[PDB]
Each structure stands twice: as structure tokens, then as C-alpha cells.
mmCIF file of C-alpha atoms and ligand atoms in Angstrom:
data_model
loop_
_atom_site.group_PDB
_atom_site.id
_atom_site.type_symbol
_atom_site.label_atom_id
_atom_site.label_comp_id
_atom_site.label_asym_id
_atom_site.label_seq_id
_atom_site.Cartn_x
_atom_site.Cartn_y
_atom_site.Cartn_z
ATOM 1 C CA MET A 574 0.000 0.000 0.000
ATOM 2 C CA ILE A 575 1.294 3.423 -1.051
ATOM 3 C CA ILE A 576 0.082 6.270 1.198
ATOM 4 C CA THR A 577 -0.510 9.513 -0.657
ATOM 5 C CA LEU A 578 -1.382 12.944 0.741
ATOM 6 C CA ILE A 579 -3.237 15.257 -1.649
ATOM 7 C CA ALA A 580 -3.626 18.882 -0.508
ATOM 8 C CA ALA A 581 -4.317 22.331 -1.933
ATOM 9 C CA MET A 582 -2.495 25.085 -0.045
ATOM 10 C CA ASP A 583 -1.215 28.654 -0.485
ATOM 11 C CA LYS A 584 2.369 29.943 -0.012
ATOM 12 C CA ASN A 585 1.876 29.935 3.786
ATOM 13 C CA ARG A 586 0.463 26.357 3.714
ATOM 14 C CA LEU A 587 -3.075 27.574 4.505
ATOM 15 C CA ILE A 588 -5.705 24.949 3.679
ATOM 16 C CA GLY A 589 -8.870 26.106 5.541
ATOM 17 C CA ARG A 590 -10.902 28.851 7.247
ATOM 18 C CA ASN A 591 -14.041 28.516 9.427
ATOM 19 C CA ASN A 592 -14.221 24.896 8.231
ATOM 20 C CA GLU A 593 -14.405 25.902 4.553
ATOM 21 C CA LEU A 594 -11.718 26.458 1.928
ATOM 22 C CA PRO A 595 -10.241 29.991 1.618
ATOM 23 C CA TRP A 596 -10.760 29.904 -2.168
ATOM 24 C CA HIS A 597 -12.603 28.217 -4.987
ATOM 25 C CA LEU A 598 -10.215 26.945 -7.652
ATOM 26 C CA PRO A 599 -12.132 24.829 -10.224
ATOM 27 C CA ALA A 600 -8.868 23.726 -11.852
ATOM 28 C CA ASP A 601 -7.815 22.222 -8.511
ATOM 29 C CA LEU A 602 -11.102 20.383 -7.957
ATOM 30 C CA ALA A 603 -10.958 18.654 -11.365
ATOM 31 C CA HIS A 604 -7.333 17.752 -10.610
ATOM 32 C CA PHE A 605 -8.415 16.351 -7.232
ATOM 33 C CA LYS A 606 -11.222 14.374 -8.955
ATOM 34 C CA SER A 607 -9.166 12.539 -11.587
ATOM 35 C CA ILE A 608 -6.460 11.786 -9.030
ATOM 36 C CA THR A 609 -8.929 10.365 -6.473
ATOM 37 C CA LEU A 610 -11.501 8.643 -8.766
ATOM 38 C CA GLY A 611 -11.957 4.935 -7.965
ATOM 39 C CA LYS A 612 -9.645 4.926 -4.944
ATOM 40 C CA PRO A 613 -10.064 4.857 -1.157
ATOM 41 C CA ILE A 614 -10.018 8.437 0.166
ATOM 42 C CA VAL A 615 -9.382 8.954 3.901
ATOM 43 C CA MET A 616 -10.658 12.153 5.519
ATOM 44 C CA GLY A 617 -11.338 13.562 8.977
ATOM 45 C CA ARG A 618 -14.895 14.133 10.194
ATOM 46 C CA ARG A 619 -14.546 17.916 10.000
ATOM 47 C CA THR A 620 -13.395 17.649 6.349
ATOM 48 C CA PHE A 621 -16.417 15.453 5.571
ATOM 49 C CA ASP A 622 -18.780 18.068 6.967
ATOM 50 C CA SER A 623 -16.974 20.702 4.837
ATOM 51 C CA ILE A 624 -17.583 18.742 1.628
ATOM 52 C CA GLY A 625 -21.157 18.089 2.710
ATOM 53 C CA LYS A 626 -21.665 14.714 1.056
ATOM 54 C CA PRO A 627 -19.844 11.541 -0.027
ATOM 55 C CA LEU A 628 -17.700 12.220 -3.086
ATOM 56 C CA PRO A 629 -19.172 10.067 -5.879
ATOM 57 C CA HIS A 630 -17.323 7.121 -7.439
ATOM 58 C CA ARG A 631 -14.898 6.810 -4.499
ATOM 59 C CA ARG A 632 -14.787 4.863 -1.263
ATOM 60 C CA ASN A 633 -15.267 7.604 1.269
ATOM 61 C CA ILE A 634 -13.569 6.727 4.550
ATOM 62 C CA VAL A 635 -14.141 9.009 7.558
ATOM 63 C CA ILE A 636 -12.116 9.072 10.810
ATOM 64 C CA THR A 637 -13.970 10.076 13.988
ATOM 65 C CA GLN A 638 -13.797 9.387 17.706
ATOM 66 C CA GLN A 639 -17.609 9.430 17.924
ATOM 67 C CA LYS A 640 -18.601 5.786 18.352
ATOM 68 C CA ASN A 641 -22.353 6.251 17.689
ATOM 69 C CA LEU A 642 -21.706 8.384 14.564
ATOM 70 C CA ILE A 643 -23.016 6.987 11.309
ATOM 71 C CA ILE A 644 -22.497 8.812 8.030
ATOM 72 C CA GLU A 645 -24.479 7.535 5.052
ATOM 73 C CA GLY A 646 -22.319 6.569 2.041
ATOM 74 C CA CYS A 647 -19.040 6.430 3.996
ATOM 75 C CA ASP A 648 -17.037 3.900 6.046
ATOM 76 C CA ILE A 649 -16.235 5.050 9.589
ATOM 77 C CA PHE A 650 -13.008 4.177 11.383
ATOM 78 C CA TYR A 651 -11.960 5.223 14.862
ATOM 79 C CA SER A 652 -8.307 5.922 14.082
ATOM 80 C CA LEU A 653 -6.170 6.462 11.024
ATOM 81 C CA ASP A 654 -4.394 3.246 12.037
ATOM 82 C CA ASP A 655 -7.606 1.165 11.963
ATOM 83 C CA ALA A 656 -8.284 2.626 8.470
ATOM 84 C CA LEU A 657 -4.830 1.901 7.029
ATOM 85 C CA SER A 658 -4.915 -1.547 8.627
ATOM 86 C CA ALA A 659 -8.276 -2.277 6.923
ATOM 87 C CA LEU A 660 -6.970 -1.085 3.544
ATOM 88 C CA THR A 661 -3.849 -3.354 3.666
ATOM 89 C CA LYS A 662 -4.726 -5.087 0.401
ATOM 90 C CA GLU A 663 -5.275 -1.762 -1.418
ATOM 91 C CA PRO A 664 -2.510 -0.640 -3.813
ATOM 92 C CA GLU A 665 -2.966 3.052 -2.999
ATOM 93 C CA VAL A 666 -4.687 4.948 -0.164
ATOM 94 C CA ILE A 667 -5.274 8.683 -0.605
ATOM 95 C CA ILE A 668 -5.400 10.940 2.414
ATOM 96 C CA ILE A 669 -7.405 14.079 1.618
ATOM 97 C CA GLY A 670 -7.207 15.939 4.984
ATOM 98 C CA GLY A 671 -7.802 17.941 6.997
ATOM 99 C CA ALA A 672 -5.103 19.538 9.153
ATOM 100 C CA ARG A 673 -5.264 16.957 11.961
ATOM 101 C CA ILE A 674 -5.360 13.964 9.607
ATOM 102 C CA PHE A 675 -2.546 15.316 7.430
ATOM 103 C CA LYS A 676 -0.296 15.766 10.487
ATOM 104 C CA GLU A 677 -0.828 12.204 11.695
ATOM 105 C CA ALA A 678 -0.545 10.777 8.146
ATOM 106 C CA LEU A 679 2.551 12.786 7.123
ATOM 107 C CA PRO A 680 5.186 10.576 8.818
ATOM 108 C CA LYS A 681 3.631 7.525 7.104
ATOM 109 C CA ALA A 682 3.338 9.307 3.742
ATOM 110 C CA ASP A 683 4.992 7.718 0.714
ATOM 111 C CA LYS A 684 3.856 10.321 -1.828
ATOM 112 C CA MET A 685 2.508 13.890 -1.789
ATOM 113 C CA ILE A 686 0.406 15.599 -4.483
ATOM 114 C CA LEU A 687 0.349 19.294 -3.625
ATOM 115 C CA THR A 688 -1.376 22.284 -5.265
ATOM 116 C CA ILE A 689 0.526 25.371 -4.043
ATOM 117 C CA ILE A 690 -1.403 28.583 -4.731
ATOM 118 C CA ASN A 691 0.673 31.759 -5.247
ATOM 119 C CA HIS A 692 -1.234 34.019 -2.815
ATOM 120 C CA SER A 693 -1.710 34.721 0.911
ATOM 121 C CA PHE A 694 -5.280 34.248 2.206
ATOM 122 C CA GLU A 695 -6.745 34.666 5.699
ATOM 123 C CA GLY A 696 -7.418 31.402 7.588
ATOM 124 C CA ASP A 697 -6.986 29.252 10.696
ATOM 125 C CA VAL A 698 -5.885 25.715 9.643
ATOM 126 C CA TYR A 699 -2.610 24.750 7.921
ATOM 127 C CA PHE A 700 -0.891 21.857 6.159
ATOM 128 C CA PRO A 701 1.966 20.592 8.370
ATOM 129 C CA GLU A 702 5.589 21.503 7.595
ATOM 130 C CA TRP A 703 7.520 18.852 5.694
ATOM 131 C CA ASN A 704 11.318 18.566 5.736
ATOM 132 C CA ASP A 705 12.180 19.371 2.090
ATOM 133 C CA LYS A 706 15.359 17.244 2.450
ATOM 134 C CA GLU A 707 13.245 14.060 2.875
ATOM 135 C CA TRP A 708 11.253 14.445 -0.388
ATOM 136 C CA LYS A 709 12.056 14.753 -4.118
ATOM 137 C CA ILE A 710 10.076 16.464 -6.873
ATOM 138 C CA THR A 711 8.914 13.835 -9.402
ATOM 139 C CA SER A 712 6.708 16.321 -11.330
ATOM 140 C CA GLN A 713 6.210 20.107 -11.421
ATOM 141 C CA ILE A 714 3.634 21.857 -13.617
ATOM 142 C CA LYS A 715 3.179 25.613 -13.113
ATOM 143 C CA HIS A 716 -0.248 26.671 -14.438
ATOM 144 C CA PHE A 717 -0.981 27.899 -8.738
ATOM 145 C CA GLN A 718 0.984 24.714 -9.572
ATOM 146 C CA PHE A 719 0.898 20.890 -9.340
ATOM 147 C CA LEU A 720 3.812 19.423 -7.376
ATOM 148 C CA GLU A 721 4.362 15.652 -7.008
ATOM 149 C CA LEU A 722 6.882 14.615 -4.347
ATOM 150 C CA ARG A 723 7.994 11.048 -3.689
ATOM 151 C CA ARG A 724 9.768 9.981 -0.480
HETATM 152 N N1 NDP B 41 -6.912 22.662 1.183
HETATM 153 C C1 NDP B 41 -7.123 21.353 1.241
HETATM 154 O O1 NDP B 41 -6.634 20.600 0.429
HETATM 155 C C2 NDP B 41 -7.996 20.797 2.312
HETATM 156 C C3 NDP B 41 -8.558 21.629 3.249
HETATM 157 N N2 NDP B 41 -9.343 21.161 4.221
HETATM 158 C C4 NDP B 41 -9.872 22.137 5.171
HETATM 159 O O2 NDP B 41 -9.300 21.854 6.457
HETATM 160 C C5 NDP B 41 -10.279 22.132 7.459
HETATM 161 C C6 NDP B 41 -10.679 20.839 8.130
HETATM 162 O O3 NDP B 41 -9.511 20.318 8.752
HETATM 163 P P1 NDP B 41 -9.440 20.207 10.337
HETATM 164 O O4 NDP B 41 -10.300 21.292 10.914
HETATM 165 O O5 NDP B 41 -7.987 20.152 10.743
HETATM 166 O O6 NDP B 41 -10.217 18.834 10.700
HETATM 167 P P2 NDP B 41 -10.006 17.369 10.061
HETATM 168 O O7 NDP B 41 -10.583 17.359 8.677
HETATM 169 O O8 NDP B 41 -8.616 16.851 10.270
HETATM 170 O O9 NDP B 41 -10.962 16.506 10.989
HETATM 171 C C7 NDP B 41 -10.762 16.547 12.399
HETATM 172 C C8 NDP B 41 -11.605 15.466 13.053
HETATM 173 O O10 NDP B 41 -11.188 14.189 12.564
HETATM 174 C C9 NDP B 41 -11.273 13.220 13.614
HETATM 175 N N3 NDP B 41 -9.920 12.695 13.856
HETATM 176 C C10 NDP B 41 -8.765 13.258 13.471
HETATM 177 N N4 NDP B 41 -7.713 12.489 13.849
HETATM 178 C C11 NDP B 41 -8.214 11.410 14.478
HETATM 179 C C12 NDP B 41 -7.674 10.207 15.125
HETATM 180 N N5 NDP B 41 -6.339 9.988 15.176
HETATM 181 N N6 NDP B 41 -8.548 9.330 15.660
HETATM 182 C C13 NDP B 41 -9.874 9.535 15.617
HETATM 183 N N7 NDP B 41 -10.415 10.606 15.043
HETATM 184 C C14 NDP B 41 -9.658 11.555 14.476
HETATM 185 C C15 NDP B 41 -11.899 13.941 14.796
HETATM 186 O O11 NDP B 41 -13.311 13.848 14.632
HETATM 187 P P3 NDP B 41 -14.415 13.877 15.791
HETATM 188 O O12 NDP B 41 -14.361 15.333 16.147
HETATM 189 O O13 NDP B 41 -15.714 13.490 15.127
HETATM 190 O O14 NDP B 41 -13.972 12.876 16.821
HETATM 191 C C16 NDP B 41 -11.462 15.358 14.565
HETATM 192 O O15 NDP B 41 -12.291 16.263 15.284
HETATM 193 C C17 NDP B 41 -11.467 22.746 6.750
HETATM 194 O O16 NDP B 41 -11.292 24.164 6.660
HETATM 195 C C18 NDP B 41 -11.388 22.122 5.380
HETATM 196 O O17 NDP B 41 -12.152 22.879 4.434
HETATM 197 C C19 NDP B 41 -9.634 19.855 4.368
HETATM 198 C C20 NDP B 41 -9.145 18.893 3.494
HETATM 199 C C21 NDP B 41 -8.278 19.328 2.412
HETATM 200 C C1 MTX B 42 -13.486 20.880 1.123
HETATM 201 N N1 MTX B 42 -12.951 19.811 0.257
HETATM 202 C C2 MTX B 42 -11.642 19.285 0.608
HETATM 203 C C3 MTX B 42 -10.640 19.563 -0.478
HETATM 204 C C4 MTX B 42 -10.800 20.613 -1.392
HETATM 205 N N2 MTX B 42 -9.852 20.822 -2.384
HETATM 206 C C5 MTX B 42 -8.745 19.994 -2.454
HETATM 207 N N3 MTX B 42 -7.787 20.191 -3.434
HETATM 208 C C6 MTX B 42 -6.693 19.346 -3.493
HETATM 209 N N4 MTX B 42 -5.770 19.521 -4.424
HETATM 210 N N5 MTX B 42 -6.546 18.317 -2.583
HETATM 211 C C7 MTX B 42 -7.488 18.106 -1.601
HETATM 212 N N6 MTX B 42 -7.334 17.111 -0.730
HETATM 213 C C8 MTX B 42 -8.594 18.947 -1.530
HETATM 214 N N7 MTX B 42 -9.545 18.743 -0.550
HETATM 215 C C9 MTX B 42 -13.607 19.461 -0.969
HETATM 216 C C10 MTX B 42 -14.682 20.232 -1.417
HETATM 217 C C11 MTX B 42 -15.336 19.906 -2.600
HETATM 218 C C12 MTX B 42 -14.921 18.820 -3.351
HETATM 219 C C13 MTX B 42 -15.645 18.497 -4.624
HETATM 220 O O1 MTX B 42 -16.954 18.996 -4.801
HETATM 221 N N8 MTX B 42 -15.058 17.748 -5.554
HETATM 222 C C14 MTX B 42 -15.856 16.925 -6.444
HETATM 223 C C15 MTX B 42 -16.298 17.679 -7.695
HETATM 224 C C16 MTX B 42 -15.339 18.782 -8.112
HETATM 225 C C17 MTX B 42 -15.907 19.441 -9.345
HETATM 226 O O2 MTX B 42 -16.817 20.308 -9.240
HETATM 227 O O3 MTX B 42 -15.473 19.114 -10.480
HETATM 228 C C18 MTX B 42 -15.122 15.698 -6.849
HETATM 229 O O4 MTX B 42 -15.729 14.780 -7.446
HETATM 230 O O5 MTX B 42 -13.912 15.583 -6.581
HETATM 231 C C19 MTX B 42 -13.858 18.046 -2.918
HETATM 232 C C20 MTX B 42 -13.203 18.364 -1.733
#
């Protein structure tokens, strides 16, 4: 199983604000869709609420500590470790966020797919700092930009 983090972030690593995104970038969302189509996507409960519904044509997996919580359309796990353990036989697992999930996933991450937006927005949640010496750029396309890093 390859563990991949996919995130859209600005130059300060901002990813969220008041549990929404600080932008709307249609080019990013269609990038996110093709990349995640047909694969297990792992998200936190707050990120699920932000989206508002299961993303179609994907196995939506939500991590919560709420034991009575049921979300229609999605699989619930009570830790990232229970999720990853249940997806052992999968060839790729895609972690979509948010800030808390990214931070816990990062040290297990094999690959990162990052949209870095050239701007500075106001917000309150961030993508965790990664040691640039531990990763290598496998692809860079400057449109914002798409950056693929492999560990
Ligand atoms: N720019 C981007 O690419 C992305 C941005 N975002 C943005 O990020 C923000 C949401 O991120 P954030 O607020 O950090 O919240 P998260 O999306 O990380 O979800 C947090 C919740 O996930 C559950 N959780 C997290 N870790 C664990 C664990 N180890 N075990 C059990 N449960 C766990 C808890 O749920 P519970 O409270 O139910 O117990 C926790 O409250 C929003 O603004 C969203 O729009 C989100 C994804 C991608
Ligand atoms: C809040 N949230 C989390 C979110 C947003 N942008 C991201 N962008 C990137 N690059 N990576 C992420 N993990 C990411 N996550 C969202 C919000 C909406 C949709 C969404 O409606 N996407 C649909 C449709 C997108 C479209 O309109 O084409 C899809 O099928 O992927 C996805 C994630």
C-alpha cells in the first residue's frame, strides 16, 4: 500500500478557514477528482462536513472518535491506524485531509500531491511543515501549480 497525501495550499500552507476552503479553484477540484476517482479516500470528520456529502465514485472513509456516529455513504473508522490496517490489500490509499489527519498521516506518507497557490489568504488551519530534504520532486507543472513529491 502506497500512502498519498493530496492537498491544496497557499504559499503559507493555509488549507482552511471557518471549516471551509479559503478559495474556490475549479482547476484544482478537477485535478483532485481525476487523481482520487476509484480509490479509497481517507478524511477527517470535519473535512467530511466541509464537503457536505460523499464524493461520488470513491470509497469515502471518515475518521472520527464518535462511536455512535453513522455517516451515510461512507465507512467510519476510529483511528487512522484502523483505516490503514483495513486497507492493507489496497494498492494506494489517498489521504485528503484535513489539518489533523494530514499531520498524523505525514510521517507515514509515501507520496505527496500538492497544489501550491501563489497568494496569501486569511485562515486558521494549515498543512503541516515537511522537511524538504526528505522528499524529491517527481513532477512540477506551473499553471498555482501541481507538485508531485515522492519519499
Ligand atoms: N486545502 C485542502 O486541500 C484541504 C482543506 N481542508 C480544510 O481543512 C479544514 C478541516 O480540517 P481540520 O479542521 O484540521 O479537521 P479534520 O478534517 O482533520 O478533521 C478533524 C476530526 O477528525 C477526527 N480525527 C482526526 N484524527 C483522528 C484520530 N487519530 N482518531 C480519531 N479521530 C480523528 C476527529 O473527529 P471527531 O471530532 O468526530 O472525533 C477530529 O475532530 C477545513 O477548513 C477544510 O475545508 C480539508 C481537506 C483538504
Ligand atoms: C473541502 N474539500 C476538501 C478539499 C478541497 N480541495 C482539495 N484540493 C486538493 N488539491 N486536494 C485536496 N485534498 C482537496 N480537498 C472538498 C470540497 C469539494 C470537493 C468536490 O466537490 N469535488 C468533487 C467535484 C469537483 C468538481 O466540481 O469538479 C469531486 O468529485 O472531486 C472536494 C473536496
